[PDB]
Design a protein around this ligand. Structure first.
Ligand SMILES: CCCCCCCCCCCCCCCCCC(=O)OC[C@H](COP(=O)([O-])OCC[N+](C)(C)C)OC(=O)CCCCCCCCCCCCCCCCC
Ligand SMILES: CCCCCCCCCCCCCCCCCC(=O)OC[C@H](COP(=O)([O-])OCC[N+](C)(C)C)OC(=O)CCCCCCCCCCCCCCCCC
Ligand SMILES: CCCCCCCCCCCCCCCCCC(=O)OC[C@H](COP(=O)([O-])OCC[N+](C)(C)C)OC(=O)CCCCCCCCCCCCCCCCC
Ligand SMILES: CCCCCCCCCCCCCCCCCC(=O)OC[C@H](COP(=O)([O-])OCC[N+](C)(C)C)OC(=O)CCCCCCCCCCCCCCCCC
Ligand SMILES: CCCCCCCCCCCCCCCCCC(=O)OC[C@H](COP(=O)([O-])OCC[N+](C)(C)C)OC(=O)CCCCCCCCCCCCCCCCC
Ligand SMILES: CCCCCCCCCCCCCCCCCC(=O)OC[C@H](COP(=O)([O-])OCC[N+](C)(C)C)OC(=O)CCCCCCCCCCCCCCCCC
Ligand SMILES: CCCCCCCCCCCCCCCCCC(=O)OC[C@H](COP(=O)([O-])OCC[N+](C)(C)C)OC(=O)CCCCCCCCCCCCCCCCC
Ligand SMILES: CCCCCCCCCCCCCCCCCC(=O)OC[C@H](COP(=O)([O-])OCC[N+](C)(C)C)OC(=O)CCCCCCCCCCCCCCCCC
Ligand SMILES: NC(=O)c1ccc[n+]([C@@H]2O[C@H](COP(=O)([O-])OP(=O)(O)OC[C@H]3O[C@@H](n4cnc5c(N)ncnc54)[C@H](OP(=O)(O)O)[C@@H]3O)[C@@H](O)[C@H]2O)c1
Ligand SMILES: NC(=O)c1ccc[n+]([C@@H]2O[C@H](COP(=O)([O-])OP(=O)(O)OC[C@H]3O[C@@H](n4cnc5c(N)ncnc54)[C@H](O)[C@@H]3O)[C@@H](O)[C@H]2O)c1
Ligand SMILES: NC(=O)c1ccc[n+]([C@@H]2O[C@H](COP(=O)([O-])OP(=O)(O)OC[C@H]3O[C@@H](n4cnc5c(N)ncnc54)[C@H](O)[C@@H]3O)[C@@H](O)[C@H]2O)c1
Ligand SMILES: CCCCCCCCCCCC
Ligand SMILES: CCCCCCCCCCCC
Lengths: 1038, 91, 90
């Protein structure tokens, strides 16, 4: 047996108000749909809503049942506005007509009406006073006094004008200039803030003042002018309410008000101190010094007044100044007051009994400050006849004593004060002496002139690669990665030089640099096809036709100009290397403004073809070795072309992780094969200690690039598991592997045998492979794009390794171009989250701005809607922003979204996309997937370009995104993502979130934007919800 | 109504004042908000105002109703007044 | 207005001729690179043309980055560093 009476035999009654000039009703017709869906029967008096423009047909069609007046008060739960008074049309008190052992919901004011409690105690009734609701965090939904104060504050401003003689706005008309009206607001409460907002929206000048320091901050946030007095007295009392002031403070405040009473035109006094009457703040001679025609509105006319000249219920013109001293301002707007009061009653009756059908409603005595027991104990005045009105004390009160909460951006500005400028200049000067001593160390260890020349062209190409990668468009970061994997296929240049023999390789050193040429020619064809297939998805169908075949004219002049200069007996290889490197730089530099993107692929093709042609022309092979080289490059290119056009673009990261390993193996194949072919030359050489060291280091770098990428492939495809595999040691093991790798360079020198050298090369390749496996497997499937870009740097620098090793000038320029590209991409992606690189690799907790324990807990409940509310709220909006995540493209749901945007753009809306930098499995993935779905690139904006347009936005669709739209990054310094730059979607009118269930993606255990009053949930799979929205937009607009 | 005589046009001044007074008399007899807020107590929709004919009084009413919070969907038969409506922010 | 007269000049250039003159600029640059390649007497000239082209691109990117409030200290800095003709005198 469940504890309670079911809702079926439990009816409610809505009586008509009998108080003089009362026009409100307790329940709207929208408010008797709920309390029928909950389960009550509803009985309404015959004329209860006629004063607030609520017809009887709306009542009897919404679910009520219209009856008379004597039998509606004998209901199980009587819900009315004011206290039950003496009925004059038939002489009886309304407490006599109530049902015995019933329950009542109205304003009571029990501390001022003991005799009405003596009438109600005889009928053994239960009383819920709406004004005794404690102002706690979980009770914003049922706060009737705040609603009446809001309506009075709006009505006082809209009633000040229509009596004031001239404009509030003020404009420069051609007839002449008029100044705005100046409005003083005394007392910032709820009516004060409502008055300041409704007066600032009409274009007036508001200069409000309040004693509590939070209310002046709310004045300066509303756009007003916070006044000040020259006495520092704490205005607060026991809590958020005010207290009585000293006589000297009142005299100084009246001095301020007499000073600024001769300049303002409207003044609204809302001052009201709990416990006693309102403070007199204006004399009868202070208010007559105003201009002839001023309006003076007093919202404290019931509880005394803020003037010694106020008739508490009428207007009068006292020497040319009108006095609006109405005692019932929400009764003049009875429709809005009835709707808000009905909403408060509905949320109260929902909160006090959350069961499906019990209505149990337990009253306790011991309760925490903020639980439901606090609300039920403070709200109930009379429980079954006895008066229990003075409520007991709560538990340990959390009390909100740090009102000014330490926001996240406050803490970095406080951390910036520890960075005294002597230490700034000292740590600036230490970096440059470190760099210049490193340059001196490179100068001392230089064996010859060619090493110095290669260091100079390395540094210059590194600065060129720094500046050309920051210049690319952020919408093209994934064609950047594909074209750097294409250009990094110039490890075939290192393969051809170490390649010799005939139709088939003769020695093992010549056989390694045919497998290297083979697996390095895969990168070229693969990267250039996937870049070409991505860049023509960005071509809008209204773009002019592009005749790219004309770029066969430079290539035939360049490559064909080499061969004609090779037939004539010249040697142009060191200038062809410069031309190829400049074309590779212009391939990235052209990928910067979206109109030259197809130029910046053809230039890379010309550079790769010129480098290969110059290498083949410099070698001058026999016609049987050229057949081997052409066969190897042709077979590798055929495999690259046939795996570069059968994939989907959403499978692009795996292919990118398949492109680095083919580089990482190739470098290991070209360093080892040069230790073998250059071995009988080390005795008669001074540079012998140079070309060994580099051949060690490249064998390390490729060894980390290969195996790590094979983990990064396997954790993206789904072969491996998405959880970070943690070992027992994990730092002693990796530190020992690194110490062994850097201490194995000591037996590699000081011992010139061939047997001890090839075992050191094999040992450093094995230790680097084990290190890549161990470091990559502890990352986890979420932080895996960083592994794609950091290794994208290493395959850059591996090229520089063989650029110093083969004395080749193209490989250093290309490697400095690629390593800086991968480094800048890893920087951008480790700044887009607030983490560091050691935080990502070594696996720290949270971010750099995370403090200690106990992150904040959520507040409020979540709204949930269906497809019909979502389509009725898409139809109403005019400017829409969609924030997608990886959940949109994992469900293959961007194809209904593109057609949805195409339909809603034709109807005259403004639909745009906001892309966060770390949405997706790759830098710039979601841009290319939206381009594949058909979205034009001019309505796809980044985070930094759209994050200030969210206040001027009617609707935001959050699709498949959790952490990039989380507000805990900007508010909670203890959270897991504190300080992360996020999309500020909560600053708009309305947000619709589409996801499966109320869960989490990776972290941040509950997202606090889901429990805001302007966010509706649209639970379901994204594919079916998005194409159902497509179907509704289609079938409704046709 | 010419270019050099628009500093002294009494009918335009009285039409401007009549438009602002028609807006500020629409409210104080209309018993709901114009703005509409999302508080934690219920969604309240904005008021919807229609303005037949945008001259001086019509555009004054459109400005005074748009700045106050409501949405305006006015109409006029001339082709320039619709562009003045779109510049003021109406429909 | 003057931008409206510039619009008919910006819209009378066919999409073929933009690509044609762009490919013409790049083929002239590549054949000039080949012409500097043929006239090279030794390897030091090729290395110096390489460091010249790279230092030219570095100088291109680094002086668009300077603040437009500091263009005359930029002028003064380049006049101070151009006193390295003493290197050629020593
Ligand atoms: C030294 C390396 C650090 C350089 C920093 C500035 C040094 C200023 C002092 C110059 C003299 C140095 C000296 O005497 O060294 C003696 C040592 C010992 O050699 P030594 O026995 O010939 O001593 C030199 C003195 N004479 C010739 C008269 C006998 O010199 C060397 O070790 C030379 C081989 C260099 C091997 C690599 C050095 C470090 C490279 C770091 C690269 C960093 C890249 C980033
Ligand atoms: C080790 C020795 C070589 C590298 C030396 C340091 C390179 C520069 C790092 C410092 C820096 O500029 O940081 C700020 C920058 C970020 O600058 P920022 O913080 O001002 O970001 C805004 C960037 N701009 C102004 C361009 C829009 O850090 C990076 O870019 C990090 C990656 C640097 C990768 C360098 C690769 C080239 C190496 C050539 C050899
Ligand atoms: C040695 C390595 C050389 C580069 C290797 C490139 C691998 C393949 C790249 C992608 C396929 C492109 C095939 C061409 C194509 O479709 O063109 C139409 C496309 C039109 O775009 P599209 O999007 O219609 O591409 C169609 C492609 N399919 C059929 C597969 C769907 O245009 C281009 O690709 C760019 C303009 C033409 C090519 C000019 C680039 C510069 C020269 C490159 C060749 C190298 C030098 C040759 C010198 C000759 C004289 C001596
Ligand atoms: C295509 C990629 C490069 C191919 C390199 C071929 C290397 C080779 O065998 O060179 C032999 C030779 C090396 O030339 P050579 O200068 O040693 O001798 C040529 C013959 N005489 C003595 C008459 C000048 O390469 C060629 O002949 C190049 C042929 C293509 C250029 C001619 C056609 C355009 C004019
Ligand atoms: C033909 C040469 C290869 C193609 C051009 C490569 C290139 O630098 O593109 C121009 C690039 C295009 O990119 P960009 O620098 O104009 O634009 C990207 C950078 N932002 C957007 C920040 C301005 O421009 C330059 O680099 C201008 C410098 C001169 C380039 C030519 C140097 C020739 C040296 C010859 C030495 C002999
Ligand atoms: C033979 C050729 C190869 C040898 C030469 C290799 C040269 C390598 C040059 C690149 C190294 C760059 C190091 C400095 C990075 C920028 C400094 C910085 O602020 O970082 C903080 C940030 C993270 O800290 P952060 O986010 O707190 O700092 C950002 C600054 N605020 C907060 C003010 C915005 O680091 C990164 O984002 C990582 C970027 C660098 C990635 C490097 C990849 C590997 C490169 C080394 C390869 C070595 C091979 C041997
Ligand atoms: C002596 C040999 C010198 C070799 C120089 C090679 C590099 C020059 C060409 C590439 C750099 C300029 C460039 O990008 O121009 C394209 C651009 C194409 O413009 P666009 O319309 O494509 O715009 C996008 C490109 N940006 C923004 C970088 C301009 O055309 C020009 O800049 C026009 C003027 C070119 C002046 C140089 C002509 C070629 C060099 C002739 C050398 C002597 C023979
Ligand atoms: C042996 C002698 C070799 C001489 C080679 C000379 C090459 C000149 C052609 C390149 C011009 C610049 C690239 C094209 C361009 O963007 O022009 C418009 C540019 C302006 O660029 P823009 O405004 O069109 O592009 C936007 C740029 N931002 C966003 C930064 C404003 O014109 C110039 O910069 C004028 C000066 C030209 C460059 C002067 C030389 C610096 C590089 C020298 C390299 C060789 C040494
Ligand atoms: N992109 C990069 O380069 C890069 C680099 C480093 C790290 N990262 C990581 O990538 C993350 C990206 O974050 P994000 O905001 O894009 O997303 P997210 O935080 O990873 O979570 C995806 C959200 O979409 C929902 N979802 C998943 N599949 C869905 C489907 N089929 N239909 C509907 N909803 C679906 C999930 O919730 P439900 O399951 O409840 O529906 C979840 O709320 C970052 O937080 C970061 O950790 C990215
Ligand atoms: N999260 C929360 O805890 C939370 C949130 C919102 C509101 N609240 C409570 O609701 C209250 C809202 O205020 P209200 O409108 O209900 O109170 P109210 O009706 O008493 O407003 C009267 C206003 O006049 C001010 N005043 C008093 N004496 C004055 C004097 N001599 N001179 C000038 N100004 C004077 C008061 O400070 C107050 O702001 C807050 O004060 C707070 O207690 C709490
Ligand atoms: N400086 C200047 O250029 C300047 C100055 C003052 C006035 N004016 C001109 O004078 C006029 C000012 O308007 P006004 O208010 O003084 O004149 P008005 O009182 O005649 O305006 C009545 C409005 O109703 C419209 N209307 C007429 N019949 C209609 C119908 N059947 N349906 C809908 N709308 C209809 C008219 O187009 C007009 O806009 C405009 O034409 C304006 O261009 C121009
Ligand atoms: C033997 C002394 C040099 C050791 C390093 C080899 C070259 C690596 C690149 C130098 C510039 C960073
Ligand atoms: C404009 C750049 C230099 C052009 C040189 C053309 C060919 C000169 C040949 C000189 C004799 C080898």
């Amino acid at each position: 047996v469940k504890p309670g009476i079911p809702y079926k035999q439990l009816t409610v009654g809505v009586p008509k108000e009998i108080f003089q000039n009362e026009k409100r009703v307790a329940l709207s017709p929208a408010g008797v749909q709920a309390l029928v869906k909950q389960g009550f029967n509803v009985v309404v008096e015959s004329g209860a809503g006629e004063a607030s423009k609520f017809s009887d047909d709306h009542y009897r069609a919404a679910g009520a049942q219209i009856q008379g007046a004597k039998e509606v008060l004998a209901s199980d739960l009587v819900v009315k506005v004011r206290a039950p008074m003496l009925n004059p049309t038939l002489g009886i008190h309304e407490a006599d007509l109530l049902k015995t052992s019933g329950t009542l919901i109205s304003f009571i004011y029990p501390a001022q009406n003991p005799d009405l409690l003596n009438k109600l105690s005889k009928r053994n009734t239960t009383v819920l006073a709406m004004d005794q609701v404690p102002r706690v965090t979980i009770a914003q939904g049922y706060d009737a006094l705040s609603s009446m104060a809001n309506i009075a504050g709006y009505k006082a401003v809209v009633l000040a004008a229509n009596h004031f003689g001239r404009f509030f706005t003020g404009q420069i008309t051609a007839a002449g200039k008029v100044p705005p009206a100046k409005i003083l607001i005394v007392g910032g409460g709820v009516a004060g803030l409502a008055s300041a907002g409704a007066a600032k929206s009409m274009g007036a000048i508001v200069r409000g003042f309040d004693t509590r320091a939070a209310a002046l901050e709310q004045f300066k946030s509303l756009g007003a002018e916070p006044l000040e007095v020259d006495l520092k007295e704490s205005g607060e009392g026991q809590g958020g309410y005010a207290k009585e002031m000293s006589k000297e403070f009142i005299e100084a405040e009246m001095k301020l008000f007499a000073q600024q009473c001769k300049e303002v035109d409207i003044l609204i006094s809302t001052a009201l101190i709990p416990g006693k009457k309102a403070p007199i703040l204006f004399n009868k001679e202070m208010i007559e010094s105003m201009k002839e025609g001023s309006v003076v509105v007093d919202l404290a006319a019931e509880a005394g007044g803020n003037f010694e000249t106020t008739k508490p219920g009428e207007l009068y013109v006292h020497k040319g100044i009108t006095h609006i001293g109405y005692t019932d301002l929400p009764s003049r707007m009875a429709t809005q007051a009835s709707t808000l009061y009905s909403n408060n009653i509905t949320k109260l009756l929902k909160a006090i009994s959350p069961d499906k059908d019990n209505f149990y409603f337990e009253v306790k005595d011991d309760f925490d400050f903020g639980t439901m027991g606090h609300v039920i104990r403070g709200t109930v005045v009379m429980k079954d006849g006895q008066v229990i009105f003075p409520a007991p004390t709560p538990k340990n009160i959390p009390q909100g004593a740090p009102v000014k909460q330490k926001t996240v951006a406050e803490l970095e500005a406080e951390k910036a004060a520890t960075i005294t400028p002597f230490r700034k200049t000292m740590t600036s000067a230490s970096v440059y002496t470190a760099g210049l001593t490193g340059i001196l160390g490179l100068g001392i260890a230089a064996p010859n002139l060619a090493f110095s020349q290669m260091v100079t062209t390395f540094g210059l190409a590194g600065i060129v690669g720094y500046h050309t990668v920051w210049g690319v468009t952020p919408a093209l970061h994934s064609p950047l990665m594909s074209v750097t994997n294409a250009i990094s296929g110039l490890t075939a240049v290192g393969g051809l030089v170490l390649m010799g023999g005939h139709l088939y390789p003769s020695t093992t050193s010549q056989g390694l640099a045919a497998l290297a040429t083979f697996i390095s020619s895969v990168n070229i064809a693969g990267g250039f096809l996937v870049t070409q297939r991505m860049l023509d998805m960005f071509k809008r169908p209204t773009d002019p036709p592009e005749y790219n075949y004309l770029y066969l004219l430079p290539a035939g002049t360049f490559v064909g100009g080499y061969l004609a200069s090779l037939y004539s007996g010249y040697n142009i290889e060191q200038i062809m290397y410069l031309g190829s490197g400049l074309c590779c730089v212009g391939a990235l530099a052209g990928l910067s403004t979206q109109g030259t993107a197809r130029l910046g692929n053809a230039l890379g093709m010309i550079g790769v073809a010129g480098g290969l042609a110059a290498t083949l022309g410099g070698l001058k092979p026999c016609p049987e070795l050229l057949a081997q080289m052409s066969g190897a490059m042709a077979l590798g290119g055929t495999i690259g072309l046939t795996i570069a056009k059968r994939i989907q673009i959403s499978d692009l990261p795996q292919l990118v992780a398949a492109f680095h390993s083919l580089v990482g193996l190739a470098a290991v194949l070209t360093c080892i094969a040069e230790y073998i072919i250059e071995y009988p030359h080390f005795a008669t050489d001074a540079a012998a200690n140079l070309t060994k060291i580099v051949a060690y280091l490249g064998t390390y770098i490729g060894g980390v690039t290969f195996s790590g990428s094979l983990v990064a492939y396997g954790k993206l495809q789904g072969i491996l598991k998405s959880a970070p595999l943690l070992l027992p040691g994990r730092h002693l093991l990796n530190a020992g592997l690194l110490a062994a790798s850097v201490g194995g360079i000591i037996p590699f020198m000081m011992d010139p045998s061939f047997t001890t050298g090839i075992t050191c090369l094999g040992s450093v390749s094995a230790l680097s492979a084990v290190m890549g496996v161990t470091l990559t497997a502890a990352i986890g499937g979420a932080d895996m794009p960083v592994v794609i870009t950091v290794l994208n740097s290493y395959s850059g620098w591996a090229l520089c390794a063989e650029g110093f090793l083969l004395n080749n000038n193209l490989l250093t320029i290309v490697g400095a171009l690629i390593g800086s590209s991968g480094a800048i991409l890893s920087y951008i992606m480790c700044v887009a989250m607030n983490r560091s690189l050691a935080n990502v690799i070594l696996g720290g907790y949270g971010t750099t701005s995370t403090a200690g324990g106990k992150p904040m807990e959520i507040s409020g409940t979540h709204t949930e809607i269906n497809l019909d509310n979502a389509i009725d709220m898409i139809r109403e909006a005019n400017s829409i922003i969609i924030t997608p995540g990886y959940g949109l493209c994992a469900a293959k749901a961007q194809y209904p979204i593109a057609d949805l945007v195409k339909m809603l753009s034709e109807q005259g809306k403004k639909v745009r996309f906001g892309i966060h930098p770390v949405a997706g499995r790759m830098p710039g993935q979601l841009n290319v997937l939206l381009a594949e779905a058909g979205v034009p690139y001019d309505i796809v904006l980044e985070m930094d370009e759209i994050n200030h347009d969210f206040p001027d936005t009617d609707l935001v669709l959050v699709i498949g995104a959790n952490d990039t739209v989380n507000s805990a990054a900007q508010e909670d310094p203890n959270s897991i993502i504190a300080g992360m730059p996020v999309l500020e979607v909560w600053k708009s009118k309305q947000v619709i979130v589409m996801k499966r269930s109320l869960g989490v993606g990776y972290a941040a255990v509950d997202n606090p934007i889901f429990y805001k009053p302007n966010t509706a949930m649209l639970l379901g799979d994204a594919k079916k919800t998005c194409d159902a929205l497509q179907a509704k937009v289609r079938e409704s607009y046709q």
